[PDB]
Write a protein that binds this ligand. Structure first.
Ligand SMILES: *[C@@H]1O[C@H](CO)[C@@H](O[C@@H]2O[C@H](CO)[C@@H](O[C@@H]3O[C@H](CO)[C@@H](O)[C@H](O)[C@@H]3O)[C@H](O)[C@H]2NC(C)=O)[C@H](O)[C@H]1NC(C)=O
Ligand SMILES: *[C@@H]1O[C@H](CO)[C@@H](O[C@@H]2O[C@H](CO)[C@@H](O[C@@H]3O[C@H](CO)[C@@H](O)[C@H](O)[C@@H]3O)[C@H](O)[C@H]2NC(C)=O)[C@H](O)[C@H]1NC(C)=O
Ligand SMILES: *[C@@H]1O[C@H](CO)[C@@H](O[C@@H]2O[C@H](CO)[C@@H](O)[C@H](O)[C@H]2NC(C)=O)[C@H](O)[C@H]1NC(C)=O
Ligand SMILES: *[C@@H]1O[C@H](CO)[C@@H](O[C@@H]2O[C@H](CO)[C@@H](O)[C@H](O)[C@H]2NC(C)=O)[C@H](O)[C@H]1NC(C)=O
Ligand SMILES: *[C@@H]1O[C@H](CO)[C@@H](O[C@@H]2O[C@H](CO)[C@@H](O)[C@H](O)[C@H]2NC(C)=O)[C@H](O)[C@H]1NC(C)=O
Ligand code: NAG
Lengths: 129, 614
């Protein structure tokens, strides 16, 4: 009933990383986007993000993320999702594209763009390739 | 509202010892030794050791200046190369008998180190103070060293977007969650350990954006919070996180007057020699329409303890269906109590540490750090509310009067380098005196009290230097009446020595001393000559120290009216006789009148014998 998206990438040393788009679940106060190590020095510490490698959002219940797809191009991981546009008085759900550097372990480079097709007449993104 | 300070002491008229190092500024950190005889000053790019008995006596000095490649790195990050890109000492704490724990901003690379006291040289430990020390000299910060472990409240990053209340333990490091329920844009003010089966607690005080309240703008709210010394975090959840973090509203207001002070500025812990329970003296200002106002609220620790131990928590709820609102939680609370310490009760149910608490309890505290009940002041009202003054820091000394009646003496600093001494007399504030500590009106950033036998002083730091003041100036008072009328629990009149003495300091006999906090100078036992030319003009100088008294003149046993042409008043106190003639000769008396309770107290200020020549 709630989607999760993933993207397998590499670190600077070639190490395997997993980018996660976990949609909001009604405890689940887990960051909506994270970079978790698939195979670290201690293998018992796998699937963990370094406390820094996440998108800290303070009010997940309000934004209510709905992930569609995660993918890469060049030195970047991209995310396609719906969330409530809280900048609008409408607080209506909107389609977004998201982008973070593959090397960025603090989500410093993280940037969001609203998607429009055509001027929001078809507001809800479903799939992409 | 509190009256005006009874007497104003100019920096010129009192003995105040000063300290500053040329080209060294921002004297924001103050720490005195065990022996109380050595005060350590933490400034911008320097640490000093001064004789606490005469701050002007510089004993030791150590610098920690930033390199040009580090200044330029900071400036390249759009910060001010000659302002913010310098090492502001933020952490100045005792580590041992032979060392101090020091952290500085360091051109936005918070760095920690150990100051070797025997050498007054840094050990080059070069620890990363990220979380322990702020990056920006603008950011809020608080720290308390408890059992050689630093408990700190500040920003976790450069921008000050991530707040943090954490413990740099090495054995068991613990920090807060980066979540609005936990901390919502806080500005750290103060922290201390409240010592004792029962565990010790480490209290934190700050102002943060309120979740329970909604108004035109975002509303700030003072917070009292605590963590348990013995915290080790949760095992499955709250891994390396506080399990004992609970917070509550700190309320300072007079509602019958619509006065609310929702911005906390300072917190002082009154550690009573007599009273078994400590009292927090908290200093607040209003967020809205501050023009400015200051209030001093005193909170009994027991009250706060009652909220954290038995109070109902607050729940967050979804409301239509994109909003969050906070309400009293009236549902079932888990056992052991979320946020509680490992006490006698827990140990009976085979709980030795936070690491073995049920996930039920740990999840609860993580989702309910905020309490529904407010922590209210003693007598449910502020101890002092003042207008036309922006108070900056506070200290309180519990002093016994001659009578034996105990007064809690409030030393309050201002944003213009001044110190006010106030006591809550019978259901009314009495501001004994005010002293201009800084000749340059530099705001008092930090304040520190030493009420110890012999070395009884207040130490105030500003950006321009540090000032050393006594707790009283009893000697400035000339007559017995003047000594009594002051209504200072520190001052008593000595008939044998003919001087107003400092009771609980001087070697005068207790049984044979005069003091009345009522101000009835009735308990007390009890001529400048001039010769001016005919036609000439006379200025008869008269002055007194009470800002609450007015002076009038008397000639030939009658109340003279200082009106044109024969008379004039220069500076509202100096009499001017204009056209001298035979009849103007004689005795001129300057008198003062001040109301104490209902009654008026007339005193003869000046006596003059004017003789006009022919
Ligand atoms: C700070 O809060 C504490 C919490 O109660 C206050 O302590 C308690 O005050 C009550 C009030 O009287 C004490 O009860 C009784 O006192 C009378 C007075 O002699 C005595 O005759 C009764 O037999 C009974 O003891 C209570 O014992 C006392 N408990 C403690 C631990 O102090 C405290 O007074 C408050 N302090 C301030 C400045 O508000
Ligand atoms: C540390 O102590 C020094 C000693 O006073 C403080 O210096 C003062 O810094 C302020 C600016 O923060 C100067 O004010 C002026 O502001 C205007 C507004 O734009 C600006 O155009 C001027 O060029 C100037 O910066 C103030 O004049 C300056 N005082 C002196 C004597 O130079 C310093 O701010 C303190 N730092 C902290 C963190 O407290
Ligand atoms: C703290 O400073 C003192 C001051 O010098 C250091 O003392 C020297 O210690 C060495 C042994 O390590 C002795 O041989 C010297 O004679 C001591 N000199 C003096 C003047 O006492 C002390 O070692 C320093 N502590 C640390 C950890 O560096
Ligand atoms: C802050 O945390 C660091 C992290 O460990 C502490 O460092 C250790 O300090 C002890 C001595 O107290 C050394 O024996 C260890 O080897 C140090 N380890 C590391 C990794 O640094 C530091 O002491 C803590 N400081 C305070 C004041 O609590
Ligand atoms: C009390 O402090 C307030 C600031 O908290 C002072 O108000 C500022 O005064 C300066 C002086 O011209 C103005 O330029 C600012 O715009 C004022 N700011 C605000 C928010 O009012 C106030 O003047 C101080 N008053 C006293 C008596 O100390
Ligand atoms: C200490 O205070 C006395 C009092 O006037 C002064 O004479 C002396 O020079 C001071 N010591 C230093 C180092 O300034």
């Amino acid at each position: 009933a709630v989607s999760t998206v993933g993207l397998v990438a590499q670190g600077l040393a070639g190490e395997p990383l997993l980018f996660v788009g976990r949609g909001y679940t009604s405890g689940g106060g887990i960051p909506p986007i994270t970079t978790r190590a698939l195979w670290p020095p201690d293998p018992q510490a796998a699937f963990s993000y370094e406390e820094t490698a996440k998108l800290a959002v303070g009010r997940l219940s309000e934004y209510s993320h709905h992930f569609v797809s995660a993918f890469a191009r060049g030195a970047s991981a991209y995310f396609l999702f719906l969330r409530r546009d809280l900048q609008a008085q409408s607080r209506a759900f909107r389609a977004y594209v998201s982008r973070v550097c593959l090397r960025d372990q603090h989500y410093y480079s993280y940037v969001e763009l609203p998607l429009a097709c055509e001027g929001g007449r078809y507001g809800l993104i479903q799939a992409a390739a | 509202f509190a009256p005006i300070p009874r007497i104003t002491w100019e920096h010129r008229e009192v003995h105040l010892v000063q300290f500053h190092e040329p080209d060294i500024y921002n004297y924001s950190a103050l720490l005195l030794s065990e022996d109380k005889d050595t005060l350590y000053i933490g400034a911008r790019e320097a640490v000093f050791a001064v004789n606490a008995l005469n701050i002007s006596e510089k004993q030791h000095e150590v610098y920690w200046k930033v390199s040009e490649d580090k200044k330029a790195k900071c400036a390249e990050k759009g910060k001010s190369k000659q302002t913010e890109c310098l090492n502001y000492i933020r952490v100045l704490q005792p580590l041992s008998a032979t060392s101090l724990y020091v952290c500085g901003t360091n051109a936005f690379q918070p760095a920690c180190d150990h100051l070797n006291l025997t050498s007054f040289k840094f050990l080059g430990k070069n620890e990363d103070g990220k979380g322990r020390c702020p990056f920006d000299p603008a950011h809020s910060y608080t720290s308390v060293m408890v059992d050689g472990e630093l408990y700190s409240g500040t920003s976790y990053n450069f921008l000050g977007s991530e707040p943090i209340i954490s413990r740099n333990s090495s054995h068991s490091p613990l920090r807060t969650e980066y979540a609005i329920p936990w901390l919502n844009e806080p500005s750290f003010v103060f922290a201390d350990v409240i010592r004792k089966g029962e565990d010790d607690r480490v209290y934190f005080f700050f102002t943060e954006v309120s979740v329970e309240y909604e108004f035109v703008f975002r509303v700030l709210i003072p917070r009292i919070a605590r963590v348990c010394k013995g915290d080790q975090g949760g095992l499955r959840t709250l891994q390396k996180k506080w399990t004992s973090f609970l917070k509550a509203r700190l309320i300072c207001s007079r509602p019958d007057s619509g006065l609310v002070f929702n911005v906390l500025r300072d917190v002082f812990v009154l550690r009573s020699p007599g009273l078994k329970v400590p009292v927090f003296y908290a200093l607040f200002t209003p967020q809205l329409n501050n023009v400015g106002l200051s209030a001093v609220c005193a909170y009994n620790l027991s009250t706060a303890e009652e909220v954290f131990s038995h109070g109902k928590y607050m729940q967050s709820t979804t409301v239509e269906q994109s909003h969050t609102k906070w309400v009293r939680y009236n549902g079932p609370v888990p056992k052991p109590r979320p946020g509680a310490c490992i006490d006698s009760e827990a140990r009976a149910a085979n709980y030795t540490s936070s690491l073995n608490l049920p996930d039920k309890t740990l999840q609860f505290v993580k989702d309910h750090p905020l309490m529904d009940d407010s922590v209210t002041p003693i007598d449910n009202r502020p101890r002092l509310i003042k207008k036309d003054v922006n108070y900056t820091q506070i200290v309180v000394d519990r002093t016994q009067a001659l009578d034996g009646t105990v007064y809690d003496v409030m030393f309050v600093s201002t944003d213009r380098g001044a110190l006010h001494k106030a006591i809550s007399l019978e259901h009314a504030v009495h501001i004994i005196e005010e002293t201009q500590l800084f000749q340059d009106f530099e705001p008092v950033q930090t304040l520190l009290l030493s009420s110890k036998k012999g070395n009884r002083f207040v130490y105030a730091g500003s950006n321009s230097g540090v000032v050393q003041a006594p707790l009283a100036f009893c000697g400035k008072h000339g007559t017995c009446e003047d000594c009594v009328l002051a209504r200072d629990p520190y001052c008593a009149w000595s008939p044998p020595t003919a001087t107003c003495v400092a009771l609980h300091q001087t070697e005068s006999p207790s049984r044979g001393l005069i003091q009345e906090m009522s101000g009835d100078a009735s308990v007390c036992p009890d001529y400048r000559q001039h010769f001016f030319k005919h036609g000439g003009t006379a200025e008869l100088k008269c002055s007194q120290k009470s800002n609450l008294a007015r002076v009038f003149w008397k000639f030939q046993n009658g109340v003279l009216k200082a009106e044109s042409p024969k008379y004039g008043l220069m500076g509202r106190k100096n009499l001017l006789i204009f056209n001298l003639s035979e009849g103007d000769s004689g005795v001129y008396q300057c008198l003062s009148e001040e109301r104490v309770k209902n009654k008026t107290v007339f005193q003869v200020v000046a006596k003059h014998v004017l003789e006009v020549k022919v």
